[model samples]
Target: DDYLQHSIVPTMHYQDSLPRLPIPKLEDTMKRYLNAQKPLLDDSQFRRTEALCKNFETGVGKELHAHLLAQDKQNKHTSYISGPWFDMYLTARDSIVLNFNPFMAFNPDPKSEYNDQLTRATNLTVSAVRFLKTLQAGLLEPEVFHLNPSKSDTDAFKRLIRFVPPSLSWYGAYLVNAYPLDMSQYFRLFNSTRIPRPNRDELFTDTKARHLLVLRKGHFYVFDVLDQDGNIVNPLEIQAHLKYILSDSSPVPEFPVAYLTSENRDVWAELRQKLIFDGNEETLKKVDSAVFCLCLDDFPMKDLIHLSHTMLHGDGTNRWFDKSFNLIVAEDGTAAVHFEHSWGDGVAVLRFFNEVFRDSTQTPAITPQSQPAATNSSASVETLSFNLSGALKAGITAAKEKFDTTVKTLSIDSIQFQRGGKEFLKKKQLSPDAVAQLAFQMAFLRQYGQTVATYESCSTAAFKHGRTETIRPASIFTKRCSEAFVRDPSKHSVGELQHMMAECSKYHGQLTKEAAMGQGFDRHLYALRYLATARGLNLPELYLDPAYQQMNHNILSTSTLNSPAVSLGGFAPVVPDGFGIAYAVHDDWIGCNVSSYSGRNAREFLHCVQKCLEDIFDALEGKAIKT
Candidate 1:
């Protein structure tokens, strides 16, 4: 049984007792909804939205609330708001390419630790495999914040290795696309699954199978890492094998299929049919069953933003985009992950990566493998190229051109705010996370000169198999304060501005906390509206109202992860004119990955973030009055 369910796995114990998402009092919901509405609405617009909200509170919303409460009582184990929230994720008309998948990059851990590319890559491999052992063993700790345990969907860690059942074909997957130190010059490809050991105490390791795939100059090759007995290959063994492949430096058939992986879902769907129809079935099967791929890469990343663009969606070959996740390592051995969003949420991957970094720190004998040993026995690599003939070749060329066009439209701004950290916010009597979010609100306001619909991902993991809910970060308090702060800082006294900031920060915290508790407004309303549709109930006018549509059309989709290990985090926005913004607040820096189709807006927005931080700092340091 692939079932790793513990007498309780790391979090299985708490799954039953986690809270049902709260049903906010109808009045409370409307009141908050109206408050969020005002900043983005005009006088008539505000009245229209208010009327709609009032109608909701007294009319169909009341009925929906009743229906929701009934559902809650009937199905109490899962997130009450999850069904519709999940439906939205899968049914969204947009493709998941850059539109939904999350991007995460980790800077090499202080280059002083491991300067060479191979040393960094090998240690990262060891660290990750070790972390995987934790997942297979069900020992990784549940995530927490400020004495509070975050929702525990530890199963997310396992899905990365085996997302599908054996009844299906998608397994033994991992791939990397090489965008070298001088990308315009060259590239390579590299590609895990897990297995049970015969011994009961033995853990699932990536080494069970003897082969590892390598894609260089668009060519595919498989090299052996396992010994004759197939016990498992050590880090040194894999490292030596990698050296052998890289040293080959000779030419090979470079049939580029990575673009096929980056194409739109439906586009690829039909083309996937073409490949099967063209008789590439066995080729597909062989590639899918491998444990994972590692790209021997070298990217001349002059900056983080460029690096983010490269890792987030840049390509050389057809990336196995269908897989749950793909590992990325830069020329310097810095690592990142391109995660397929459908498989799981950020909490799962975040925890897994953090654990890898944590274990890398603890296990010194393994980290830089500071001992640095080389394997005695070397194995030859087998080159494996795809069956790219007639139809497949044309389809790939079409996919490649489109993939290039799609990536060209994506503009990313990686910001590293260095003046302060969360401590600065706390010392000034603020909640660090909330304050950071509030700054984004102000930053958007200053740049766009208007309010926009916003969605911040809030975890509902406290409940069993919980995922995420939308937390509207642009509160009315945020709207008012940013308008006042930016419109005329001279009009408001320093004390007044600070007080307003404090209030904005306060509401940001409350709304986010409400979201964490699964009491977020969007998910609840989504459940009511969609459930009404599912049951064939006449859709309420409230849901069809212009106000409702405008309110939820997320223009600035932002999610924050405050971990030192993250150097960049974000995704492409849901709407064309919007942005996908992710922030990481560390001790020495606040890193952000801001993406938008409009290059000008993204750059301006970054400037605004800097402006907002300075204003906040001025207030705290008593510099606002002088400014």
Candidate 2:
């Protein structure tokens, strides 16, 4: 009851002062306002703002605070309470308000940077308050009244706001005590939603239009638009010539060759209509003769898909290649040659395309010596054929082997053990400090030969990543262990092996550097890499997994994670899926693994690993464990 009075009531009161705003009402206002003024807010911008606000008021933002509070009460015995929620609150509150534009009495010049900052702050505060109030009313009911602030309630508001800063600071200290907090998640989350304004075609056509030209190898190119003969065309030239080609009188030529494979027939049929010349014979006559011969092979098809994949998912090492390029034929009864980006750039691909066209268009000629050979009876008849069946089977086997090898080589053992360790750590019911101390003691155990029981029962480091601050590992172990003692004082004492794992779920972020270095430091890439390796997967593979794919498609099809202004205004935000664990070993390498499902043995193994590390760290720090 006392705990509820102190924490729950404060949160409830904070909610009352800033209740959730009515989304429907806002949408109606936007619609009416847009209709009243023809050019004030464009349809897209208006819709975007309306959608953002609606999501913020009704979706995850409104529920998160309550969830945090609930998690706090349930996991109060663990060290994680001092890290995850508190740090999240601080970072979210500060970064989220950076772009708000509140309508206020202080009419400062909009162009002034200081005024922009003030506007942003005011709007953020207003939105935050509204969201908090709505959340409180929905969950706690009548107790929500405590959130109301009197006109003279400046002191109360200040006090409530004050709680967040220290709370964040207190939690931040734990990160410094444990490991560096990776800020990439926060950055990725903050930059998720961004909506561009709509413009007319004339604006797009104008010289002033925003345009970017990217270089590939030595040439510049664009993805959209094709030549008259349906060949890969220069992007800029094609764009400029589109109107003329559409108005041309020549008939479009139909190539007899089937370009698409049987498996891709349906999808290709749909896309071909969009990509190729629309069944007009007259249009083919005006097609550039230089480009027409280029269509004899399928080089363009493979190049286009490869370029697109690189833009979307390239991480410097991996690249996309078309497997079916060798299957395409040109109209003139010639095979198409496939080109790879690794061999050349976009410009090189285009150059190669042009060269192939030039070579194919050359007139056929026969030499006297060649004619004599053809006429000679001595010319023996000969036939040559390829064993395509055997070749294809060999290719498939090689591809499978390559994929398996890549997965194995990149696999990190530490991730698997750490994942199991997380479940074990959770059962221990230790405070943040006790957990830290335990980690320190265990570090020592590994350094010096300790009792067999200590060695056997002890787990590895809760954080597999290297330590940031000198004291972090010890602090987490100690805090967690202390909390466990407080929870069941009569049953458990300091140092008796309690096989229970204290859930460190809340403190997982501490494994990254941002939590250790400071709030704004960017280290999500490191975290992402770590997470990616531990899972023995890549982003595309993970997203395509049946379970995650469904979840992501449902969520991301309608939302964004960029621009907290958009997220706070009301937009579904994106987050990673799957679970991961880490544990430090005596060797330089740490081990980790992840899975979609949670199992009891897996949990026990993780618990044992964490206990071993904590015991090791504790002994190193000169802490005693009861035999």
Candidate 3:
């Protein structure tokens, strides 16, 4: 609906006036840091950490914080965390498959008739190009989060905003409690790929390339989606080309070149050089330069569990994890977007997801009754052939083996708690996200009998060139609440338990607000540590503290996305023994898509989460607590 009035306001109209992400004061960051560690540490350990924190506060930390502020002041165009965060992701040697890339499954079309694979793919392609055109023409609506839509989302607000200068537009919106986010990351939503390098990876984007890369049956095909005049190609013809690619019954490749993308970064980088050395330079370039990837899977998703595995890390051969994002369609017309994380966070990707879904479903360019063009579609499509030497072939086989081994170690499970959801919690004046987080804490304690580190991602997009900030949810409030609920529900009265739940919700809400405002301690501490390392200073005693190591070892990595277009989404665990939890609390139900390595049990964890939700709901309804 936002894109419907595209030209009413330019996409970057408020960018120039967006606020810069601020660095928190040293004392505030220190106080927050200690409070975050309180729940995870014992008495003696807390005392030692307290001393370390005190020393760091009065010693090297102040100097580091001062230097960080100076550096931030020098860099006026971007946030303080931008460079270090990018470096942190790029320098990591892990394969992006299970570790970094995340997937968001799309909801089915409202009309069941258009759920055909051919029809859906065609509609998606045409809608995507239209989105690209709208963005490039500066007609896309600027992204804004209105605190009070009744006032800020009105026609009067638009009329007032349209006349304001670009440099003052954010202030104008702010006066009405409207926050317009930075759109700096939107450009990479198209024509971008993460290129492999020896020690690090590089991001590459080529806007001149008009082709769309389609992967099917372990084969790659490309066709121009834009005409010479930069207009979108005909819908019928696009349908014809997609139909041809789907119907082509070519045998699967013996070695899917895409497997190389799943290999460890350094290994893939070497193989990439080998690819060029073996005379496949232009072929590799074509893949790297395409607008975006479209994967047409031959099989249908059986259920939510199947969809999670398929979308998260498909058969190693069928996916190119390096692309900015892949629009994948299954045989039964199910679709999802799996994207490389280093390009941008979910803000940019989710916008594209919602818009394309809206445009394709609401005003479809081609219908179920529409016929493909009678022209020769094959002539417009090109099948990329890689000139592989024995080494390259051997490299592909090795990469495939690594990918298969790694993916097999993963376990994924899903659950939907229908007892209560966002509306129910809101009626009780509770934050839905905080409730979900409290459930995670209770579930982990119920299963494992101890608390460990947890991570929740919060976007900082309100500031210029902002990415994500970490929200530490394992606080003393959650720990106390989890203990009371899980250890012995009979020992505590229902009123006492309800009071504890409210405290957890209140604290979690505060943490979320702080993280969103760029006032959290995680990024500030991380940036300071990175600055210490970059400056080649001697390691401080605070940096050597064991508590720091324990805190960074996230055993529960979780993220939440509340969107109409997203049915569910997931990623693999950040650590070998951890669980990657993706949850959504809708109007009537709460959904979770969880993943873990073999060391942890994803199915059992999901079951515990459901039970926890039930317990919380029963307490909210003034019933006797169930053990």
Candidate 4:
């Protein structure tokens, strides 16, 4: 009851008076930036960076900082970085596949476990409706440090739900694969209607006027969850619609039109233009404007790793990486979600999925709720098909061929260490998340032979429409500590490794704390860079510095989301030469997904992560030995 009192609800409103994200002072940040580099740079490099900092203090950097201060003054009530942040998201690059996006394969519900197609689809469909309704009622608690918050402590306990006006627009309706793009036109939206598949271009809006599009074999079909009154359809009703689609339509085989979304965005934007040359404007709009998407993949898999990979990319024909999210259910009752990264990190999706999964179990009909969808309403599912010209059909064939070849080059490794996870660490008084974070630091340093820039996302959910801040955990403390283990394991003592763990844990905690406070350096630096472009100012020398580029390159891009009780998550390498690590720390185990592409050694990276975790476990248990 106490927890419920603080959670966001109409009766217990939260004031949106929490302080806006602050603008970092140029002087303060210049030195701080230097400190962030201290772990990685050599003496010569440090001297050069110091010189650059000196220039920044006196030159165009000063002018930029002044402009930033004034801009914050003018926009004091809202986030100072939201506009540039959005611009960065859309304007930043993506061919999709987790680097620009990511995948989250959900664990089965405690009771339901998605053991059958109808139950899985029905549960998800019902969850989607209720989650949307939760967003509408504002009854869902704003996610914070934890579920509980104090009513009187405005700054500390203020609910981010009030700040999440953007999320309101997201779940409000309903909602891609990247197959790459320059100015890709994979459009975004909200609504309950199932959407038409790409390339196949059939049933353009069959899910049109509908609530969700169900993709099977290769065909596109739409099903509506809302009636004339626009309320959540009953569970029995939602199940029946899914059942009919399965029974009425045989799956399409050779040509999955949805593959168009998985095509490189640059390619999609271009080919889609050619598709429009065939003048399918109405069909294109159906693909672009639907609220969200659902995939009814008949692909069967029992192993978690295979299921995870399937959710990560799937036959390369069944995903739309450009959409904000994809809820995919496979044959035999398994389901998982693949989502775009630029839209937000795992936490962004975490906020939504937890709410959905939490309330999805109880039957909506039997449970006490209001305003159910009208039974036997006039709304109906429809098939979307296209009249393909010879040339257009040929283009899709070419795109599909290229997509298959591209996906072949990528690889994924899910590392599960089923012992002494977060709970054990807490029992020992270590920072649960931070300790695991250091293990990653240890892994990166060992694999690369030295520390490189790394990123761990810190949520900024406290601010309205806030997203993330890069928490750089590759600090000097981690470097020295991990290097010690790798450099001399024979001489390395358990006390020494434990000491390293403690120091690294403290450092990581501080990094995360600063990041969550919205005082992170990277986002501020990015905003400054964006402002420079907007002002048409000449590029500053500070940004041109090699150290600047090195840090931003982020060779080890990673983030942690252990909630919704997930065991594993996967993300693409942020850069071709780097790695993307998403690990979920469970009570007695850890599930890590390490990925690499652009010809980088992802399997090698995975091995390093495996060895590092094992090496540490040995160190902790006094079993580590000389290599």
Error of 4 at 470 (Å): 0.6
Which of the two, 2 or 4, has more TM-score?
Answer: 4
User: Candidate 3: lDDT of 143?
Assistant: 93
**For residues 1-627, could you state the per-residue lDDT of candidate 3 as single tens digits?**
212336577788999999999899999998888898999999999899999999998999989999999999999989999899989999999999999999998899999988899999998888888888888888888999999999998878887798899999999999999999989989898988999997779999999999999999889999999988787888899899999998898899988899999988999999999999889989988899888899999999998888999999899878889999999999988999999998777688998999998998899888999999986877899999998889989999999888888988998999989987989999988899999999999999999998889999888999998878889999999999999888878888888988998999899999999999998999999999999999999877876889988888889999988789888999999999999999999999999989999999999999899999999999989998775
- Candidate 3: where are CA atoms >4 Å away? 1-5
TM-score winner between 1 and 4, please give it.
Answer: 4
Worst 10 residues of 4 by lDDT: 176-185
Q: Candidate 2 overall Cα lDDT vs. reference?
A: 0.24
Give the residue spans of candidate 1 off by over 4 A. Answer: 1-11, 23-27, 57-60, 111-115, 144-217, 220-231, 248-255, 286-293, 316-318, 361-383, 536-539, 625-627
- Go through the candidates in order and give each one's C-alpha lDDT: 0.63, 0.24, 0.90, 0.65
Name the top TM-score candidate: 3
- For candidate 3, what is the total of clashing residue pairs? 0
Give the per-residue lDDT digits (tens) of candidate 4, residues 1-627.
101123343321322433356677777677668878998899999899999889887987787888888888888655777667756655533456644656666666566444566677677667765655554455545433432223322443234333444424222111111000001111222342122233222112222343666666666666666666766656666676676667655656466666666655556666667677777777656554455667777767767657757888877666765556788888765677677655443554665666555555544233222333344432466676766777666667886787677667667777778767877787666787776777777777777677788888876755544657888888888887788888766666788878887888888888788887776788887888888989888778888998999999988887677665354667767777887887777888887787777667767777777777777667666675447
User: In model 4, which regions exceed 4 Å deviation?
Assistant: 1-8, 11-15, 112-114, 146-189, 192-210, 248-255, 274-279, 344-348, 364-379, 490-493, 621-626
Q: Which candidate is the best by lDDT?
A: 3
Off by over 4 Å in 2: 1-316, 319-411, 414-429, 432-444, 447-471, 475-627
Q: What lDDT does candidate 4 reach at residue 217?
A: 68
Models sorted by TM-score, best on top: 3, 4, 1, 2
What local lDDT score does residue 85 receive in model 2, on the 0 to 100 scale? 22
